[PDB]
Short mmCIF file of C-alpha atoms in Angstrom, two decimals:
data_model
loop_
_atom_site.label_atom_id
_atom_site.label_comp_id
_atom_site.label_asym_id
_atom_site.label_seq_id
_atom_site.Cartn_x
_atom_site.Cartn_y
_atom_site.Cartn_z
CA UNK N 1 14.27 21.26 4.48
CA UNK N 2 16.53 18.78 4.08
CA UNK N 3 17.59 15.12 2.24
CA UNK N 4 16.53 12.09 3.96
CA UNK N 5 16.66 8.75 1.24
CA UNK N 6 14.20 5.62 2.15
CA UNK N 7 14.27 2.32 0.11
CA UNK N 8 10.71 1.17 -1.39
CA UNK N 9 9.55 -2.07 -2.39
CA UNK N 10 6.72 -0.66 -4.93
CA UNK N 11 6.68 2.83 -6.14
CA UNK N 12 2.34 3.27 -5.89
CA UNK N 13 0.86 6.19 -5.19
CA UNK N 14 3.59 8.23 -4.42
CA UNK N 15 3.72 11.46 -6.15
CA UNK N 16 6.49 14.70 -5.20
CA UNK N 17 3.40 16.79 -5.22
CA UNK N 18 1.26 15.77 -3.02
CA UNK N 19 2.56 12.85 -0.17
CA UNK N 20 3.02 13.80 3.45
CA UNK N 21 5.24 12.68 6.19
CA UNK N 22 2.73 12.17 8.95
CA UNK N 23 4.02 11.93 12.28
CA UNK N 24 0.95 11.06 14.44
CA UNK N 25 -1.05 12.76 12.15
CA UNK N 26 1.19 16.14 12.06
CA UNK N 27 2.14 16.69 8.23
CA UNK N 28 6.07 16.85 9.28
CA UNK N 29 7.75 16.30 5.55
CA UNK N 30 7.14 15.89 1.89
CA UNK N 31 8.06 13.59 -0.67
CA UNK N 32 10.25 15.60 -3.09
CA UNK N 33 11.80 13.26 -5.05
CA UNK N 34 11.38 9.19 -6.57
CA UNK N 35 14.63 7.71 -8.14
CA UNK N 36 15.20 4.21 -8.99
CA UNK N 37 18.05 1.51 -8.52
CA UNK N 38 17.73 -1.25 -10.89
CA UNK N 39 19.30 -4.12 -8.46
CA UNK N 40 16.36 -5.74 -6.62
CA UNK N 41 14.18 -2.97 -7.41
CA UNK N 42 15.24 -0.79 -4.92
CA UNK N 43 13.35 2.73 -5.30
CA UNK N 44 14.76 5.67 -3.48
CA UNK N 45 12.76 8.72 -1.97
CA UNK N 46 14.00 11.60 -1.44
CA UNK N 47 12.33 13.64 1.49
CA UNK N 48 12.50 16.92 2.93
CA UNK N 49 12.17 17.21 6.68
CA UNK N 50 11.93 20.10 8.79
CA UNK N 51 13.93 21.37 11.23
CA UNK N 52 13.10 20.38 14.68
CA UNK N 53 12.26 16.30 13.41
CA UNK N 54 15.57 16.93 12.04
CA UNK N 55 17.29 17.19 15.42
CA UNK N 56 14.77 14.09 15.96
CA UNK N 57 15.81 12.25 13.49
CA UNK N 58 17.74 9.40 14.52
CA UNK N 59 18.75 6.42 12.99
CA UNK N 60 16.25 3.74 14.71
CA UNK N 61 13.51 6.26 12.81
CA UNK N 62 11.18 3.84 11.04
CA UNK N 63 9.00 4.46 8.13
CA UNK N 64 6.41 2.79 6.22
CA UNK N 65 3.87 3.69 3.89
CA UNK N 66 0.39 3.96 5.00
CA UNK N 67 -2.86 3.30 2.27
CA UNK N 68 -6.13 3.84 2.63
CA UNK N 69 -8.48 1.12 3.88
CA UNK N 70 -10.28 -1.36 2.41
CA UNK N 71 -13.45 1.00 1.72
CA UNK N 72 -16.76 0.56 -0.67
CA UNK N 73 -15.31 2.81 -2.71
CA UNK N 74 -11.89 1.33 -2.98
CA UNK N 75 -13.10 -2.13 -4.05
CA UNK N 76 -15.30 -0.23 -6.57
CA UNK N 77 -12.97 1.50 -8.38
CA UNK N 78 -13.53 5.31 -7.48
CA UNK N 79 -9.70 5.68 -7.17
CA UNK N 80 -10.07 9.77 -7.39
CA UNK N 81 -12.83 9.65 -4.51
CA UNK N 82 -11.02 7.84 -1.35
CA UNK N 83 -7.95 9.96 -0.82
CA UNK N 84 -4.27 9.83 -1.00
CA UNK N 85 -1.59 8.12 0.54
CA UNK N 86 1.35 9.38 2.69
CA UNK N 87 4.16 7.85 4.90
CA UNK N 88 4.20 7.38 8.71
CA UNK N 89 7.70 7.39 11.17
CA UNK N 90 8.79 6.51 14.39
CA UNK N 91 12.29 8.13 16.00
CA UNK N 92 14.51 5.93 18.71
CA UNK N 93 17.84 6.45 19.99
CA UNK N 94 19.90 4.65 17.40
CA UNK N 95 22.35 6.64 15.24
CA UNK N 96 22.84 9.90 12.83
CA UNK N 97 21.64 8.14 9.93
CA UNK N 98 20.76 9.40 6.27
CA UNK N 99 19.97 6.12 4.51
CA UNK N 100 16.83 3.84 5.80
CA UNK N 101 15.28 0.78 5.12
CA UNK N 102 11.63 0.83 4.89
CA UNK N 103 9.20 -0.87 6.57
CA UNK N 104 6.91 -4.05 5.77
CA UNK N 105 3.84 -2.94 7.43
CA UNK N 106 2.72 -0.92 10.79
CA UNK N 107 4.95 -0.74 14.08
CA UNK N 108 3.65 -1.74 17.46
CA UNK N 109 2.13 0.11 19.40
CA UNK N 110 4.10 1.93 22.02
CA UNK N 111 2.88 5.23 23.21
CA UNK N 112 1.00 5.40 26.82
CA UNK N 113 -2.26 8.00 25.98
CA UNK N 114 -4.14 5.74 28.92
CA UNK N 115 -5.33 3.44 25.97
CA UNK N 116 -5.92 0.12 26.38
CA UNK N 117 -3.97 -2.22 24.16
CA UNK N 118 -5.62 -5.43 24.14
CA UNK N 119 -5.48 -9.17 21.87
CA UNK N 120 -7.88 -10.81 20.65
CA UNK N 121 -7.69 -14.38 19.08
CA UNK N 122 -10.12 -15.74 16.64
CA UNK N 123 -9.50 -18.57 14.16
CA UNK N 124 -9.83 -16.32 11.19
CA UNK N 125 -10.12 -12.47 10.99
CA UNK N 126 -13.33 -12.79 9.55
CA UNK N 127 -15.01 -9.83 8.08
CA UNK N 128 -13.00 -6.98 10.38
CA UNK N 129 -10.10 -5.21 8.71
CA UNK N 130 -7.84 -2.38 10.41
CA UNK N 131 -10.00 0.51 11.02
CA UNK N 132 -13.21 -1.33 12.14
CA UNK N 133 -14.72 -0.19 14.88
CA UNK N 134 -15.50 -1.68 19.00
CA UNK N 135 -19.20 -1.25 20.30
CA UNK N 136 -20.19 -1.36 23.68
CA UNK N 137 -24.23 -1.04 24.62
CA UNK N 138 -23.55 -0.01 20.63
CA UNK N 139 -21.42 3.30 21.43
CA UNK N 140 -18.24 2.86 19.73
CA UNK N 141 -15.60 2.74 22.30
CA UNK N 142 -12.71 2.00 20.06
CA UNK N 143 -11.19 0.66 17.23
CA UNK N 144 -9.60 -2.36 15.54
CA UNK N 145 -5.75 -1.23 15.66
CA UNK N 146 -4.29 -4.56 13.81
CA UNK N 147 -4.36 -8.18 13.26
CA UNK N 148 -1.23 -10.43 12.46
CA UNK N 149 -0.94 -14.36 12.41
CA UNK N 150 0.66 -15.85 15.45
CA UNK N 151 3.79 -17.85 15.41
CA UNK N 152 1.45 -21.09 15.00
CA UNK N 153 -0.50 -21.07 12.17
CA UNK N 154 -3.62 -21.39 13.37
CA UNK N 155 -4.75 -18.54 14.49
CA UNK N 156 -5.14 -14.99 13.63
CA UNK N 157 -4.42 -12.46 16.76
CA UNK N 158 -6.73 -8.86 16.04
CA UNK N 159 -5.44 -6.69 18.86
CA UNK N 160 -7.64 -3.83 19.42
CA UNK N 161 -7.40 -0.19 21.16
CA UNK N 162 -10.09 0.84 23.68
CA UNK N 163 -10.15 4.67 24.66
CA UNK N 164 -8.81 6.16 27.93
CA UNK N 165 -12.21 6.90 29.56
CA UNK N 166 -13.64 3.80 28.48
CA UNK N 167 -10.69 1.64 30.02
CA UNK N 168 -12.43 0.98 33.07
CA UNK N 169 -15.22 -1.19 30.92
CA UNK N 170 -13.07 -3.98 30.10
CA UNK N 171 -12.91 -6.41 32.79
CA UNK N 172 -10.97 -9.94 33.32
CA UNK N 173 -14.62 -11.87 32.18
CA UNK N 174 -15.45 -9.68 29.41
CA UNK N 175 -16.51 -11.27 25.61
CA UNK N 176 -15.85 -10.07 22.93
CA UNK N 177 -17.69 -11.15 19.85
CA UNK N 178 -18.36 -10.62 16.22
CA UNK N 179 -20.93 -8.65 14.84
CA UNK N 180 -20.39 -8.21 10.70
CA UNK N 181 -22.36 -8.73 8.16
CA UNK N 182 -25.77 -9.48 7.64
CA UNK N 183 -27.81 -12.43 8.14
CA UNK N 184 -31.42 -13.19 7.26
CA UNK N 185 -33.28 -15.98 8.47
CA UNK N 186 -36.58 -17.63 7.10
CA UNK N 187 -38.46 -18.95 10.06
CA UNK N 188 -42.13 -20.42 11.09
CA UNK N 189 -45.15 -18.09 11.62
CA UNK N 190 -43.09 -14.98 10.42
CA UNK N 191 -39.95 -14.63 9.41
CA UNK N 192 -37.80 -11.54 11.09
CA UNK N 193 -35.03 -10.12 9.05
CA UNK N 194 -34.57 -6.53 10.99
CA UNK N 195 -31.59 -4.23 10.01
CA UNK N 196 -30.00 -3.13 13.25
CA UNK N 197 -26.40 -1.92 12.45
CA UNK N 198 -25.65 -0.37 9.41
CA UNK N 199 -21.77 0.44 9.85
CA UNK N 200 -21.07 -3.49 10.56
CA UNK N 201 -22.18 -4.03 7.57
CA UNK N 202 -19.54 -2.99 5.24
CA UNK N 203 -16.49 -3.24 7.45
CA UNK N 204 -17.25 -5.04 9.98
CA UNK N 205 -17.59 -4.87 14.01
CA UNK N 206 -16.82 -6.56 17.81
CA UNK N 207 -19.31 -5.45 20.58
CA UNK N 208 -18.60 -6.52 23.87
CA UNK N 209 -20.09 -7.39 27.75
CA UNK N 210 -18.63 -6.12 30.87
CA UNK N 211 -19.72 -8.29 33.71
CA UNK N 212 -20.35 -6.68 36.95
CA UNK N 213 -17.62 -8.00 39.76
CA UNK N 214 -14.27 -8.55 37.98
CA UNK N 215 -11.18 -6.66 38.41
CA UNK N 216 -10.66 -4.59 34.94
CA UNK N 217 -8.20 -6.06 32.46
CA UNK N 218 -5.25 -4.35 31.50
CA UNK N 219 -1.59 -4.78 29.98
CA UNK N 220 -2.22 -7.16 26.35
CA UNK N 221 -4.03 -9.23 28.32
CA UNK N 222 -5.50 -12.01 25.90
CA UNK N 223 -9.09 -12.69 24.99
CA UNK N 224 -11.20 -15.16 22.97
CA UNK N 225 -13.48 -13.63 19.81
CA UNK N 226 -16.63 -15.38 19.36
CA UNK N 227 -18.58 -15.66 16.17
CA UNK N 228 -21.54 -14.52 17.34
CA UNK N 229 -23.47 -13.39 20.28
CA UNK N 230 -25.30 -16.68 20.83
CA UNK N 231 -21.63 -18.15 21.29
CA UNK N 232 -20.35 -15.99 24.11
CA UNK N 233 -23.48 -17.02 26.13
CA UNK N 234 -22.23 -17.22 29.66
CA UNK N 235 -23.43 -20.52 31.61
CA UNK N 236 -21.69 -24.14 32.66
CA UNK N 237 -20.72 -26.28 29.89
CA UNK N 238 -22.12 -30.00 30.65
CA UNK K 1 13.96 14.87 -22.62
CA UNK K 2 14.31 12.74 -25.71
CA UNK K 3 12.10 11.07 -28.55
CA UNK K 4 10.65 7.51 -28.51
CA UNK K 5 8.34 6.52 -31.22
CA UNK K 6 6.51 3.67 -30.39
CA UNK K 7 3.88 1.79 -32.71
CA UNK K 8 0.51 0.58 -30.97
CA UNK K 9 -2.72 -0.33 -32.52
CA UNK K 10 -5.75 1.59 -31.18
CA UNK K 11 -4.71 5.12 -29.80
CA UNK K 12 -7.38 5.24 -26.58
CA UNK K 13 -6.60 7.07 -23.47
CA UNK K 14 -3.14 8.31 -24.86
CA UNK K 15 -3.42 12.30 -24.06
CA UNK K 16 -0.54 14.32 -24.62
CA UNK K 17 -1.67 16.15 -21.48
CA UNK K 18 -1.41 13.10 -18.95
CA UNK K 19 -0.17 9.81 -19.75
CA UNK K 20 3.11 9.06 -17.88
CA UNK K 21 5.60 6.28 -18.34
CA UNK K 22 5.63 4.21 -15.24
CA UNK K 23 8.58 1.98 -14.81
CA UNK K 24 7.70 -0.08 -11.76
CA UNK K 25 5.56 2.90 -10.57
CA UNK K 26 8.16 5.60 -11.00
CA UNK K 27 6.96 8.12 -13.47
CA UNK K 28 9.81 8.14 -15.82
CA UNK K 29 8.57 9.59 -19.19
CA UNK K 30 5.53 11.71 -20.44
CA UNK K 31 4.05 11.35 -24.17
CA UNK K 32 4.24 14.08 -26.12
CA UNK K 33 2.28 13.22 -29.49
CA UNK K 34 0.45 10.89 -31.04
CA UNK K 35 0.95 10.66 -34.84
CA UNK K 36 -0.36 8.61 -37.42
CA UNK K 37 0.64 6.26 -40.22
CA UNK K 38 -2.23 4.96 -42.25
CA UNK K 39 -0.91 1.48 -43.23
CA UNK K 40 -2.35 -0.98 -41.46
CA UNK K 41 -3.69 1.39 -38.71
CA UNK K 42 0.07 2.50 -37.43
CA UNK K 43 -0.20 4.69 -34.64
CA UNK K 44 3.27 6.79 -33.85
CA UNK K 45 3.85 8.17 -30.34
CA UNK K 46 6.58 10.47 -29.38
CA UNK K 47 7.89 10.16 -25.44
CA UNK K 48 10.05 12.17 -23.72
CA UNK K 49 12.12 10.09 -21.41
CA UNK K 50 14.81 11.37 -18.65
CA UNK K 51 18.14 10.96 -18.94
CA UNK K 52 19.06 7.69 -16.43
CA UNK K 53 16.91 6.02 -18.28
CA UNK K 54 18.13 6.73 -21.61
CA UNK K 55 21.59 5.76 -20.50
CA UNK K 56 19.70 2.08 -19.85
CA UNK K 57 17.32 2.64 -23.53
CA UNK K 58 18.37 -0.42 -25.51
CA UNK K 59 16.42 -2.44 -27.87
CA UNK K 60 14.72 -5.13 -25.97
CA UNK K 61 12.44 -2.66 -24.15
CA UNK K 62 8.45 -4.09 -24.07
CA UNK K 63 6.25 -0.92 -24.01
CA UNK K 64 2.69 -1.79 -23.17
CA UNK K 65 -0.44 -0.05 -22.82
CA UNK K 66 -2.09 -0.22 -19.07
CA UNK K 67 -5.45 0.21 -18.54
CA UNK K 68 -7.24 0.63 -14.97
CA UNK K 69 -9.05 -2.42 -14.08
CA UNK K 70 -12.72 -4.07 -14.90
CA UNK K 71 -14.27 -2.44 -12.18
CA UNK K 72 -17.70 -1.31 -10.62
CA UNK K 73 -17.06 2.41 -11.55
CA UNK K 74 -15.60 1.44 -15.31
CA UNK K 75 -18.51 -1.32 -15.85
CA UNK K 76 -21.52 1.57 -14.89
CA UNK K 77 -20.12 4.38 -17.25
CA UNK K 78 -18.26 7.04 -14.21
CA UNK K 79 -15.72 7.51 -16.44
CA UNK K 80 -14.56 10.28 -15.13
CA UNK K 81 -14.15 9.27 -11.70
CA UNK K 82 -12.13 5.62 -12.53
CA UNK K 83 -8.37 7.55 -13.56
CA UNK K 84 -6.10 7.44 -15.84
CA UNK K 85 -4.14 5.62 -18.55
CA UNK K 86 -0.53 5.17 -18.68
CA UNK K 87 2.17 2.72 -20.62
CA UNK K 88 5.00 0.53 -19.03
CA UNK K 89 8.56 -0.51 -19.79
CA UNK K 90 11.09 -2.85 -19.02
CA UNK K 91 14.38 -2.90 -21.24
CA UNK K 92 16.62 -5.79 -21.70
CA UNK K 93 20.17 -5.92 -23.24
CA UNK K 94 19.48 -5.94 -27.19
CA UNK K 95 21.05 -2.70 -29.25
CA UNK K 96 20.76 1.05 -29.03
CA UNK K 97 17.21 1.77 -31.12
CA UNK K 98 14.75 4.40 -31.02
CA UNK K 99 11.40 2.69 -32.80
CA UNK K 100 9.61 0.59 -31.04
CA UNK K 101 6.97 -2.17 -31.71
CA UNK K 102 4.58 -2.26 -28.38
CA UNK K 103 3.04 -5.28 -27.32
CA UNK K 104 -0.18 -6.39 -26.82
CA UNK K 105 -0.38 -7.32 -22.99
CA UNK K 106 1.74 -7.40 -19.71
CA UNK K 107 4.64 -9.03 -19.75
CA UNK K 108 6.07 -12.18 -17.65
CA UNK K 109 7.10 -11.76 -13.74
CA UNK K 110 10.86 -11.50 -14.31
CA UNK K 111 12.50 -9.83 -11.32
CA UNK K 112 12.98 -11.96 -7.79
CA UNK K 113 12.17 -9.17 -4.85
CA UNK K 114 11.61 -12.37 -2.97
CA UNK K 115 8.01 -12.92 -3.65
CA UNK K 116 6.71 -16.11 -4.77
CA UNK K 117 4.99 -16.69 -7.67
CA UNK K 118 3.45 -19.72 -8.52
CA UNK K 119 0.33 -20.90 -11.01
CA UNK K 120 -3.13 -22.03 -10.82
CA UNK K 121 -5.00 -23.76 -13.32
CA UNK K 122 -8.52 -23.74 -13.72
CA UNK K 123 -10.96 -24.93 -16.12
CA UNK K 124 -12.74 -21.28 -16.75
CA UNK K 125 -11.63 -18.19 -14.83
CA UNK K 126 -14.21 -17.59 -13.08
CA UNK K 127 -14.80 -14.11 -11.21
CA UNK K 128 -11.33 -13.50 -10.85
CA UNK K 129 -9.75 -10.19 -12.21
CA UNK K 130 -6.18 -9.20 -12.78
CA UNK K 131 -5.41 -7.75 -9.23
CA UNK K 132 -8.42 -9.54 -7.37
CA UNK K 133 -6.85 -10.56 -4.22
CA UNK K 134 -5.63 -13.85 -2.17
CA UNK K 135 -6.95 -14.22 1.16
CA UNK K 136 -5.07 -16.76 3.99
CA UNK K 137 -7.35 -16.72 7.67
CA UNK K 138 -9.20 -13.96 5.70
CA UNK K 139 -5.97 -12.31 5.94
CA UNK K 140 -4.62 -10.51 1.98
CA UNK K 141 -1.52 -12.16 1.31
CA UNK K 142 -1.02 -11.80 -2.35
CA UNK K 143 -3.00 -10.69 -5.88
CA UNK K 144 -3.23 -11.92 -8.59
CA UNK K 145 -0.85 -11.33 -11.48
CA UNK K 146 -2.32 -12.37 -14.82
CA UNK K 147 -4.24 -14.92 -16.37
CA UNK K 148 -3.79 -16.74 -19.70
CA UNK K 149 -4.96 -19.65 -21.53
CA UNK K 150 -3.06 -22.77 -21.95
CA UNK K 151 -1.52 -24.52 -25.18
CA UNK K 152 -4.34 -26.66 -25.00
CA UNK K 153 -7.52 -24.69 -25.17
CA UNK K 154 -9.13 -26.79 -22.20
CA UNK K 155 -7.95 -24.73 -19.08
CA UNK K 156 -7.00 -20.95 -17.76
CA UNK K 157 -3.90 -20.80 -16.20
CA UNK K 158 -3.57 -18.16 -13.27
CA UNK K 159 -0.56 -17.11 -12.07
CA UNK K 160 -0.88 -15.24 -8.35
CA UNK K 161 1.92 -13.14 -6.66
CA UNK K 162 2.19 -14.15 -2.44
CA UNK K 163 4.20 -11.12 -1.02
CA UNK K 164 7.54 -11.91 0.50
CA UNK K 165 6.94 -12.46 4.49
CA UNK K 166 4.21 -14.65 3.39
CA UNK K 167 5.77 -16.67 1.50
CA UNK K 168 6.54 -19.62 3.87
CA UNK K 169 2.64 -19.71 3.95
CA UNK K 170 2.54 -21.51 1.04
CA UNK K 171 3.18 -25.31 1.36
CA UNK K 172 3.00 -28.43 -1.19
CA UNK K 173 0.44 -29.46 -0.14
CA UNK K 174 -1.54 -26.37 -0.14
CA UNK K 175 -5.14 -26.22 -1.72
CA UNK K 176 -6.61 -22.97 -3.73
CA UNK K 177 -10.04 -22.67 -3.90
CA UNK K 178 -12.31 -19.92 -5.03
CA UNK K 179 -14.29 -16.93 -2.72
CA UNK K 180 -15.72 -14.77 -5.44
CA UNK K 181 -19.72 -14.02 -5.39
CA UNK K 182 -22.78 -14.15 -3.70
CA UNK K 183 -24.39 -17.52 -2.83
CA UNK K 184 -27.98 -17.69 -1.41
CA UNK K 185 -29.86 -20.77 0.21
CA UNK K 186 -33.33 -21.48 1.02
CA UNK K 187 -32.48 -24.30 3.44
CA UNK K 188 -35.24 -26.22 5.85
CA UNK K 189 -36.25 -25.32 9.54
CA UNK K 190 -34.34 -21.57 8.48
CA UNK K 191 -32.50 -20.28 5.68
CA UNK K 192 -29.19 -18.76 6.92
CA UNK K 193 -28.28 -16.26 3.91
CA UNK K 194 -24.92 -14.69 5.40
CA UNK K 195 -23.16 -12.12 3.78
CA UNK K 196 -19.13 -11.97 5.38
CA UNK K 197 -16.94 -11.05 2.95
CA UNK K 198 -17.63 -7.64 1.03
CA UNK K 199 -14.58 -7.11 -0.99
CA UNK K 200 -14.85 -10.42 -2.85
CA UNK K 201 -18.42 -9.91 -4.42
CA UNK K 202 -17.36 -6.98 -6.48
CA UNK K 203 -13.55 -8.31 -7.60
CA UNK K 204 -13.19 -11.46 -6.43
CA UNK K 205 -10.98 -13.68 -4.63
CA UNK K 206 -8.72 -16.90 -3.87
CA UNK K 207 -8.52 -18.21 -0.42
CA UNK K 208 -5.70 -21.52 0.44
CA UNK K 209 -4.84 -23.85 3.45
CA UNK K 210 -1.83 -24.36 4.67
CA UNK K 211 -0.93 -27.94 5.97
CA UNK K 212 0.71 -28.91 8.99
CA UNK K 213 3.63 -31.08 7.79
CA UNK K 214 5.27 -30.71 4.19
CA UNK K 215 8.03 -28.85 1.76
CA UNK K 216 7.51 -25.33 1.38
CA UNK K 217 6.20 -24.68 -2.08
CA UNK K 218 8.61 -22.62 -4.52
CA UNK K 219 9.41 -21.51 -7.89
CA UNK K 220 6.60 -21.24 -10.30
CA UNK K 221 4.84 -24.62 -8.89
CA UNK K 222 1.18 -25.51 -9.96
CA UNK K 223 -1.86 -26.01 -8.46
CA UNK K 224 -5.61 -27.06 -8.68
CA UNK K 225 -8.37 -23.89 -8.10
CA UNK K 226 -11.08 -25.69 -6.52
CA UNK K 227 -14.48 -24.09 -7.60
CA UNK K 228 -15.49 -23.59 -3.75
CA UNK K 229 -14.52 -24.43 0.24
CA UNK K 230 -16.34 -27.67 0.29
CA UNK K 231 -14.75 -29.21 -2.97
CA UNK K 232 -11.16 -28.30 -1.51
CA UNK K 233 -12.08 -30.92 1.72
CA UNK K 234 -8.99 -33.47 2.54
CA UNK K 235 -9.97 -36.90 2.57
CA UNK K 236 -9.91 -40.55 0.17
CA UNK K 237 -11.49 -40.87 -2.99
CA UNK K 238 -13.79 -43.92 -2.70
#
């Protein structure tokens, strides 16, 4: 229990009853308090911490609020249905330090579980949005962890998270491309529209090959997203 | 804890149980009752407010009733799955008063949290909602704010909100066009019917460009909404 104050841009679904403090998913404090400060629209939150974070807490500690994703049920208006929202923090060395500046969006990630951290960069982001999920032979092998626009403005950079036992899949000639969606074609002497994949369908998905001799990628190494299986066709361009 | 009688027209959604006062999100006051006066269908609620914002209670406060949003769970009847109602604020300079004349919709974007806010004008709105969303590289940049018709009765302008990193997005030269549907084709030698983006068939949405070379845009600067992708193409009119 104690008084830790964090400056909001927008005051939405944050309630004193019911918002957690989750540290890597470990319900560390609650949100006791919302006051306002009329310059700029600052908002400040009081929160109550407990007592071994508190030794923790430092002042390069920093927090942003986390929402629930883009579901079918939040774009269709069942607001009591999807959940509720809470805050996330990271601690560094920094300072003692009562008074913090939130965050924009998600950090970086930085912890070493044997993941693999890994960029992918496509021309648009397409129908994936944080949370979708990374097939291999169709087995789900990871997730999407974030996307961001580069520095150029061309691009959109998705990097993804592939599980520790599954590291050893991704190799240096490995493709990654987009499965989302569904698309039904009208063609001579029949016409086959099958229904393979029913989770791409309403968030979206990135299946991948893994060659057979290549040394296995590692370390943000970068890779190009194709649109569509039929694009990351290997063979010799003439 | 005080009393604020304020004067609306049609009493719906206003319990005495739960309807807060949200001042930029931050649940300030509660409603306690909801008289009536029977001239001209007068409607008198009492509100308790807390005592920081009585201190900055003056006579230029615009209370308005808020509504969730046209939504798939509000259009099929789930009523009791959508939420609740609530009423917002914003006071001004004016006078010390305690009755209050409410207004009829949301008020203008006043405060500068370093978000840009510029309009669109199109000839019909389209699919677009109040808090449908804006879309750069497929990426949600910014929502929409409000809509409302111009002096002239020919066109809808639409007046979006890009958030504040994003704002350098935005260019001069940029071109809005409109994402919001489903659109089906029986073409020749196959039909490709693809479905990619979920989230703007139920709301709808507003995608832009960016340009290469030009003036960032600022400051409430307008813009065509091109009806679709292929109408917002660069090129000379011949």
């Amino acid at each position: 229990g104690n008084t830790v104050t964090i400056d909001f841009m927008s005051a939405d679904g944050i309630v004193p009853g019911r918002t957690p403090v989750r540290y890597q998913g470990v319900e560390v404090g609650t949100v006791q308090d919302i006051s306002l400060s009329d310059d700029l629209r600052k908002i400040e939150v009081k929160v109550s911490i407990k007592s071994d974070m508190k030794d923790a807490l430092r002042e390069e500690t920093q927090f942003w609020l986390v929402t629930p994703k883009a579901s079918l049920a939040g774009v269709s208006g069942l607001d009591a249905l999807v959940g509720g929202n809470y805050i996330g923090m990271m601690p560094g060395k920094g300072k003692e330090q009562d008074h913090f500046v939130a965050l924009d969006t998600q950090p970086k990630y930085r912890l070493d579980n044997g993941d693999l951290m890994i960029h992918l960069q496509a021309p648009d982001l397409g129908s994936l949005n944080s949370g979708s999920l990374v097939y291999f032979r169709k087995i789900p092998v990871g997730k999407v962890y974030d996307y961001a626009i580069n520095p150029n403005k061309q691009g959109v950079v998705i990097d993804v998270l592939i599980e520790r036992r599954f590291t050893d899949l991704v190799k240096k000639g490995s493709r990654f491309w987009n499965v989302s969606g569904v698309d039904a074609n009208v063609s001579i002497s029949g016409a086959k529209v099958k229904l393979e994949s029913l989770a791409a369908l309403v968030n979206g998905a990135i299946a991948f090959d893994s060659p057979e001799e290549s040394k296995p990628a590692e370390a943000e190494d970068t890779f190009g997203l194709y649109e569509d299986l039929a694009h990351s066709q290997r063979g010799v361009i003439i």
